[PDB]
Amino acid sequence: MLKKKQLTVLDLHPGAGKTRRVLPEIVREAIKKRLRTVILAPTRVVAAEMEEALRGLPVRYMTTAVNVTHSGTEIVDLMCHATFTSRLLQPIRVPNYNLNIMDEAHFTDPSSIAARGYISTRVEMGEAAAIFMTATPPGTRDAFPDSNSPIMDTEVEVPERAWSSGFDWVTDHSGKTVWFVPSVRNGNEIAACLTKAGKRVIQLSRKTFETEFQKTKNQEWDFVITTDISEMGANFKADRVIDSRRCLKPVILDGERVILAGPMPVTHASAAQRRGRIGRNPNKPGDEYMYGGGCAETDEGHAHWLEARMLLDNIYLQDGLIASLYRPEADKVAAIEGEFKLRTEQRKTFVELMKRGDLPVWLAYQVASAGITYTDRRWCFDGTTNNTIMEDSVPAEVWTKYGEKRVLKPRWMDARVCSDHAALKSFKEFAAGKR
């Protein structure tokens, strides 16, 4: 694996021990061969679990999620996928790592796709090696891979709303259930229904994941209600997955706006990762996978691949060259390599709108490419009437940094800034100049 110009896909089935058994072997070999190595974890939760798997090996944990005193001598770095892409974008020295290891390399967030495109391009240039660790590499067509113990797969109608009758099998279960929902809002409704039926429910989503995931260890629970974030190496002591088989797809319409289309079917990779949460204990056969729809390749035309091109266009590689997407996922977008390359000051604004602004990549790009500066929030209020953001079925209002009450009406509408109460809260704070 460790020879230059090599990219290896380590595609052992879910729970085969890629993280706890194979990764420490790779890291030991890399240290023996004096390869400057990066390990990319999808989440702070996984970074902390990797520290346990690698404990004693000289690894620099480039995250506050890990409480360790470093030697200062480590040649192996661990950081999040997003941190890798972030440091590449910023005026910060990123070592030209000899060996690039991506764990949960199926992750479809824009910064993960961008990281794969950067790494795979360095490998194609002959500059580096890489190992992509995932049961479900891009384009996989198998939603039912092998497991540590047999799984009972059942196609069944799964509720996506509160129910009064017709789903007794959901609440009649005496074990622990992980339930994949298409959105935070849909999980909120199902969670309230289960809570009303006497169930103990934990909800996970991207924004809440580190805090709330700890509750799955610290308290007794009957259901975890989660979005697709729990596809990225989140482990549960559960005996059932309920899978809507549905997700939201951000879609750019007419180059002008982003909508959250669907819900619609997940990919085969996503379905296999959702299922893969159970069947993991070779001593506990008969874990259950209840699935409520088919799979489809909904990654095609998904905004994350275009957003990944916006990130890669603004990462220095060599002179004017630009990193390509990882070949197996490169057809998911129709973009011209370099079309999103910004001049120095607009690139800095783009980065800050993502990093401090917490804006979606697409929206950060519209603002930065318009020549607007980071603190100039006039664009949050001067859009078309149809870009009016609603709160409780009336136009949302903020006090501008000038002290004027104004309707939230962004010049560019990205549905991700108001897809749930927390997102809208954060975007109101942005529009008000509060960060």
Q: Which of 263, 265, 176 is nearest to 225 (CA)?
A: 176
Separation of alpha carbons 131 and 104, rounded Å: 11
Determine if residue 145 is labeled as part of a ligand binding site: no
Shortest distance, CB of residue 281 to ligand UR7, whole angstroms? 33
Residue 67 beta carbon to ligand UR7: minimum distance, rounded to whole angstroms: 11
Residues interacting with ligand UR7, by CB under 6 A? 60, 62-63, 70, 79, 83
Q: How far is the CB of 297 from ligand UR7 (least distance, A)?
A: 34
Output the CA–CA distances (angstroms, integers) from residue 140 to 96, 272, 293, in the order listed. Answer: 30, 9, 18
Sign of CA dihedral 340, 343, 346, 348: positive
Written as six digits, the tokens of 316 are 């220095």
Q: Which C-beta is closer to ligand UR7: that of 76 or that of 238?
A: 76
How far CA 141 is from CA of 7, 269, 296, 329, 365, in Å, comes to 21, 7, 9, 14, 33
- Per-residue DSSP letter, 175: S
- Burial (Cβ within 10 Å: 0-12, 13-18, ≥19) of residue 103: buried
The helix or strand, by DSSP H or E, that contains position 192, with its residue range, turns out to be helix 184-196
70 among the known binding-site residues? no
**What sign results for the dihedral spanned by CA atoms 218, 224, 225, 229?**
positive
In terms of CB distance, is 45 or 333 closer to ligand UR7? 45
For residues 71 and 165, which CB has a smaller minimum distance to ligand UR7 in the complex? Answer: 71
| Shortest distance in whole angstroms from residue 90 CB to ligand UR7 | 9
User: Which secondary-structure segment (H or E) carries 398?
Assistant: strand 397-399
By C-beta, is 43 or 83 nearer to ligand UR7? 83
C-beta closer to ligand UR7: residue 348 or 428: 348
195 annotated to bind ligand: no
As measured in angstroms, the least distance from the Cβ of 42 to ligand UR7 is: 14
Q: Least distance in Å: CB of 231 to ligand UR7?
A: 23
Would you tell me how many other CB atoms lie within 10 Å of the CB of residue 156? Answer: 14
Interatomic CA distance for residues 422 and 230, integer angstroms? 19
Q: Which is nearer to ligand UR7, 71 or 219 (CB)?
A: 71
Of 5 and 70, CB closest to ligand UR7: 70
Q: According to the annotation, is 16 in a ligand binding site?
A: yes
Beta strands in 15-55 (DSSP E): 37-41
Task: Give whichever of 87 and 341 is closer to ligand UR7, judged by the CB atom.
Answer: 87
Q: How far apart are CA 309 and CA 111, in angstroms?
A: 10
- The answer to whether 19 is a known ligand-binding residue is yes
Query: How far apart are CB 93 and ligand UR7 at their closest, in Å?
Result: 11
Radius of gyration of the chain (CA): 22
Rounded to a whole number of angstroms, the minimum distance from the CB of residue 80 to ligand UR7 is: 7
User: What whole-number distance in Å separates Cα of residue 7 and Cα of residue 250?
Assistant: 30
Which 3-state string (H, E, C) describes 259-290? EEEEEEECCHHHHHHHHCCCCCCCCCCCEEEE
Q: Would you say 15 is a known binding-site residue?
A: yes
Please identify the residue of the shown chain whose CB is closest to the bound ligand UR7.
62
Rounded to whole angstroms, what are the CA distances from 41 to 99, 106, 138? 15, 12, 18
The binding site comprises 12-19
The binding site for ATP comprises 12-19
